[PDB]
Amino acid sequence: MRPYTVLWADDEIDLLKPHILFLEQKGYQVTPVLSGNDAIEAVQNNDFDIVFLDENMPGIGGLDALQKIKELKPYTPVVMITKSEEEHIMTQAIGGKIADYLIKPVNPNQLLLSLKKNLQQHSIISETTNTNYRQEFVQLGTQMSGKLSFEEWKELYRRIVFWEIELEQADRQMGELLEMQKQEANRLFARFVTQNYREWIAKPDTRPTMSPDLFKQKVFPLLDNGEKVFFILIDNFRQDQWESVKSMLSEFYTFEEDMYLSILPTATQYARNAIFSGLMPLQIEKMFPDLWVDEESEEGKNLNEEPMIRTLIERYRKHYSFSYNKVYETKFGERLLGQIRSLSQNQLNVIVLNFVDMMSHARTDSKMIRELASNEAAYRSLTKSWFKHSTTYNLFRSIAEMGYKVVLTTDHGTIQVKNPVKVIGDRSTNTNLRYKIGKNLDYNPKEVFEIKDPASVGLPHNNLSDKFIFTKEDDFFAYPNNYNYYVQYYRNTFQHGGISLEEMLVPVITMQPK
Amino acid sequence: RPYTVLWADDEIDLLKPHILFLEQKGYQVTPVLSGNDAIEAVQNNDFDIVFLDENMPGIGGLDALQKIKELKPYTPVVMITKSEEEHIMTQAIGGKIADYLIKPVNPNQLLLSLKKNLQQHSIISETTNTNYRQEFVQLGTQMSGKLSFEEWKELYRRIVFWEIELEQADRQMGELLEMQKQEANRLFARFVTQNYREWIAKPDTRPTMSPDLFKQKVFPLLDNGEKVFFILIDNFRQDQWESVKSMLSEFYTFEEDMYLSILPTATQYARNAIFSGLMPLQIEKMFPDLWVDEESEEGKNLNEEPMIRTLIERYRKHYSFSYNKVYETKFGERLLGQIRSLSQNQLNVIVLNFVDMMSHARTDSKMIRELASNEAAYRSLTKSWFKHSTTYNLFRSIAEMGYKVVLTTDHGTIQVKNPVKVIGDRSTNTNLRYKIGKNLDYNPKEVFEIKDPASVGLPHNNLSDKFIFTKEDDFFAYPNNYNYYVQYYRNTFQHGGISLEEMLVPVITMQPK
Ligand code: BEF
Ligand code: BEF
Ligand code: BEF
Ligand code: BEF
Ligand SMILES: [Mg+2]
Numbered sequence A: 001m002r003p004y005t006v007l008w009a010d011d012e013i014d015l016l017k018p019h020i021l022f023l024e025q026k027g028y029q030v031t032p033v034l035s036g037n038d039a040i041e042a043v044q045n046n047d048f049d050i051v052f053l054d055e056n057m058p059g060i061g062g063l064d065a066l067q068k069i070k071e072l073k074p075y076t077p078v079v080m081i082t083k084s085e086e087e088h089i090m091t092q093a094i095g096g097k098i099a100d101y102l103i104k105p106v107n108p109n110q111l112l113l114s115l116k117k118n119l120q121q122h123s124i125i126s127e128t129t130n131t132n133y134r135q136e137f138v139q140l141g142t143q144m145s146g147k148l149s150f151e152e153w154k155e156l157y158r159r160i161v162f163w164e165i166e167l168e169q170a171d172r173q174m175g176e177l178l179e180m181q182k183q184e185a186n187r188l189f190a191r192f193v194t195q196n197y198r199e200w201i202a203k204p205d206t207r208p209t210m211s212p213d214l215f216k217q218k219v220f221p222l223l224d225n226g227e228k229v230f231f232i233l234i235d236n237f238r239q240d241q242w243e244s245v246k247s248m249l250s251e252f253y254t255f256e257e258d259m260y261l262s263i264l265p266t267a268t269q270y271a272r273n274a275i276f277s278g279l280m281p282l283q284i285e286k287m288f289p290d291l292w293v294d295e296e297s298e299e300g301k302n303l304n305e306e307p308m309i310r311t312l313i314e315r316y317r318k319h320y321s322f323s324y325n326k327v328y329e330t331k332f333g334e335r336l337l338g339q340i341r342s343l344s345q346n347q348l349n350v351i352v353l354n355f356v357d358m359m360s361h362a363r364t365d366s367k368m369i370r371e372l373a374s375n376e377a378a379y380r381s382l383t384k385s386w387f388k389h390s391t392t393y394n395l396f397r398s399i400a401e402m403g404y405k406v407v408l409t410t411d412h413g414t415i416q417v418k419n420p421v422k423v424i425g426d427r428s429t430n431t432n433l434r435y436k437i438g439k440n441l442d443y444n445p446k447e448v449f450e451i452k453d454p455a456s457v458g459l460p461h462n463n464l465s466d467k468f469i470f471t472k473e474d475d476f477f478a479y480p481n482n483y484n485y486y487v488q489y490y491r492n493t494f495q496h497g498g499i500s501l502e503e504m505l506v507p508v509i510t511m512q513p514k
Numbered sequence B: 001r002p003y004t005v006l007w008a009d010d011e012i013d014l015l016k017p018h019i020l021f022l023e024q025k026g027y028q029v030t031p032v033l034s035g036n037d038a039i040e041a042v043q044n045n046d047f048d049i050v051f052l053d054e055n056m057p058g059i060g061g062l063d064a065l066q067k068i069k070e071l072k073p074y075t076p077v078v079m080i081t082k083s084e085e086e087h088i089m090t091q092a093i094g095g096k097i098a099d100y101l102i103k104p105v106n107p108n109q110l111l112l113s114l115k116k117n118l119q120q121h122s123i124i125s126e127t128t129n130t131n132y133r134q135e136f137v138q139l140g141t142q143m144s145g146k147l148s149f150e151e152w153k154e155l156y157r158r159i160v161f162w163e164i165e166l167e168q169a170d171r172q173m174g175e176l177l178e179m180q181k182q183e184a185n186r187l188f189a190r191f192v193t194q195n196y197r198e199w200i201a202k203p204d205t206r207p208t209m210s211p212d213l214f215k216q217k218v219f220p221l222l223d224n225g226e227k228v229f230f231i232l233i234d235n236f237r238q239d240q241w242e243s244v245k246s247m248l249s250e251f252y253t254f255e256e257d258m259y260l261s262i263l264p265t266a267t268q269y270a271r272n273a274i275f276s277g278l279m280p281l282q283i284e285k286m287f288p289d290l291w292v293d294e295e296s297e298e299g300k301n302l303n304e305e306p307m308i309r310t311l312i313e314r315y316r317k318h319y320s321f322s323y324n325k326v327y328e329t330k331f332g333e334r335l336l337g338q339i340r341s342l343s344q345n346q347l348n349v350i351v352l353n354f355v356d357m358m359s360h361a362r363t364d365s366k367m368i369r370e371l372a373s374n375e376a377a378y379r380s381l382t383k384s385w386f387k388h389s390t391t392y393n394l395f396r397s398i399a400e401m402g403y404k405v406v407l408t409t410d411h412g413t414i415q416v417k418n419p420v421k422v423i424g425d426r427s428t429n430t431n432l433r434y435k436i437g438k439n440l441d442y443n444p445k446e447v448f449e450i451k452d453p454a455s456v457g458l459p460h461n462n463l464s465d466k467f468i469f470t471k472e473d474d475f476f477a478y479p480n481n482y483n484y485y486v487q488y489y490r491n492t493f494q495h496g497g498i499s500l501e502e503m504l505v506p507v508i509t510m511q512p513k
């Protein structure tokens, strides 16, 4: 290697000769200077790896030297090594983007620690992530194997996502080894769902929490305990997207993290209507035929969610005051943000955000989103940018100021599809690549989850359709009339409505304002 | 509220003085004696910060760190230990500790660490606010008077720096800077309009511009017998460079500089000028086979590789070189594989294209409006695209080849605000910031007006063909449906006119570490 270079500025550098010898023995080149002006010049005309800085020096002070050095080379770490214990100096150093602040007398090893932490942090963390994943990779495969409970599935998926993000900043083949494990997880999760889905619908008392159960399990207990709640539903928000925005929200909230199961199809007109109605889609139609819109109509499929909310509140003999707001466009979030505090009168404030859904679909037809979200790390990254720079960030921030509980959840996720499944003859479901509705559908029954009795899984259908077929894993339906184009166009896009961990196992977070 | 600290040390009884000190300072400390006790405490509470001994009976502090970061990844952990072994330091760093303090620890060092890890964001805001209020004065005197080109580069670099710094500060301070930026752009437009003709007419005395870029910044390197990668990112302005330079600092050291794009600040003219070494006009007369009239339907920057060849010929050089355009991040994969095969050449040209902001597709329009509503968001998208596209590894891999890299752009872009009325035919171009026209109508005091394109190296078809250019953050708007197109194009990013963002663009000479 080459040695890391250290520029050290102190009016009494002679008193630090022992420390300089120690660092020089550990492979570091130290250039000493005696003033801020000499340190500034050295930084200007050199490319030092790190800068050590005294505060009290004849001439300009370290805090003033720090400002200049940060404008010249803001990416260069600066450590303040001073005898000052004044809080004012600490405060201004932190504010000046100091990397470390060490109070004299300093143990030389404390300087070694700063040098490693501030110059080799990334490679150290990278090597530990690989090492830790190598240790735990086996434990994850076996944890996967066998017959897992629902709660065991939650923790496994939680563990897989964690490694998805950790291994972004680590070795490649560790990352593609995780992809294999994730692939195997989705396969085994698919069997878990198809073997139990009909029973889940049949026996509502022994089933995991699903869309129709969401409000009863996670909202009503809060409201019944006297608490004021903001139910915020970001449509098409996967588990790994929650993990991406989690740290940002931690500045303002504490979390109780949970997950729950979306119903099939993992689509908005079914799962999200089931949430706000508290019922399986078929039960919405029977009990409230005026609020259900069947898949044929050109009318909107989720325009009646507020009335559904009122029937659910009434259906459990609750008297909650509530509001419902639906946000698509950029301007309407700023407007809702402006009128946010007028909602303080209501116990329950429901907010639906549709942009991640829009963006997720734009991964198919928008060259721009094909660039910004080429892979799932970019998609997560792009989700961070949106959350921070849209009005969503300050919306969550204003709610916290209002002393409101927030239940942050979604209706379904989405998955990056890879391999086609042939199909033909459906009705009006060509728009969805993960589920299909119709009669006389030619397909391979081995490749899908067949629902020939839709009313058994709480699904309505008009007389021109009698069955549902769902994809599994990362498959997507493809027609043969324009097959080769169809396949090249939709491969690697994001699609929902089928069976996968990404689509079905989705977050529900109960957040308390700090 | 009081900040809460979880402190796990098997000798917690000897740390009672530190604890009392910290309780006097307003913190609530919870003492525990082992890694398992701490793990359980974190599991059932929301502590703000964790202090962690390493050597304890039971599990080691390092084992506790791994589990606590799993439970509360967003909670800072400070290791406070007597151990001075290097492998312990390294392992704790790997375990994502916030700090590592070797015993005995100054109690003020605990306080500092609590400020730096629990209140650093709000501290940086107040400090940035206070610093800028003071620097606001020097930026006023620095843009006062008549500035030289070198002074315009310093000032523009200064304004960009504070633009990004003030992302983390009070809104009012950003408003205050926004107006200093307005004034800078107003004065910069005067500076350009008063000198642009002189610059084109006197090549030996002008600032470095598009047609001079290769001679000024590339040929000297090669002539000094050093290999070079010339990477041109389309529509990559100064603050986008400032947004990605830290990522690049892990593999390069920088010689940062700027240069002026010619007008229009549009790929068809500026980038062709860079590669041809000539002005867009004299492209056609010097080289008919190379030029493409703007009015031809097929692409205009497809035969740039031959333009580069004639440039090498004109200056009597014999560089072996390559040329590669990467439209999409998928094509970049192939280039990344074959990238080491380009070690044979002295010069390697790569054209990268950042997301098209000219997209009229309804979906792109809806994305753009939400993902890039302001300049902070635009920079954030820029960083995201750079890291997760093939661009990041591309620079990473070129560094391993030990090549010098010249990173630059052909022009920038600006967020437009106010409409400027203009009347023209169906023929007239779509660009919001500049028009070409046989019969253009406009307030000549609202634009930079080039009645004879031929004098400034621009082509034309008719005697009556003009070029007109917007300044500051103006954008052209036609009378038909003027009210609608004003509302649609306002706050969108455009290029082709006169502004610091469009015109004064980065050129970085980078040395692999
Ligand atoms: F003089 Be220094 F601040 F220790
Ligand atoms: F719009 Be939904 F997520 F199908
Ligand atoms: F016992 Be601890 F590591 F100081
Ligand atoms: F023609 Be480029 F988009 F400026
Ligand atoms: Mg001193």
Ligand SMILES: [Mg+2]
Pocket: A056, A057, A058, A059, A060, A061
């Ligand atoms: Mg002084």
Ligand SMILES: [Mg+2]
Pocket: B009, B010, B011, B053, B054, B055, B056
């Ligand atoms: Mg101990």
Ligand SMILES: [Mg+2]
Pocket: B055, B056, B057, B058, B059, B060
């Ligand atoms: Mg032990």
Ligand SMILES: [Zn+2]
Pocket: A235, A236, A267, A268, A272, A357, A411, A412
């Ligand atoms: Zn949805």
Ligand SMILES: [Zn+2]
Pocket: A236, A268, A357, A361, A496
């Ligand atoms: Zn959707």
Ligand SMILES: [Zn+2]
Pocket: B234, B235, B266, B267, B268, B271, B410, B411
């Ligand atoms: Zn361009």
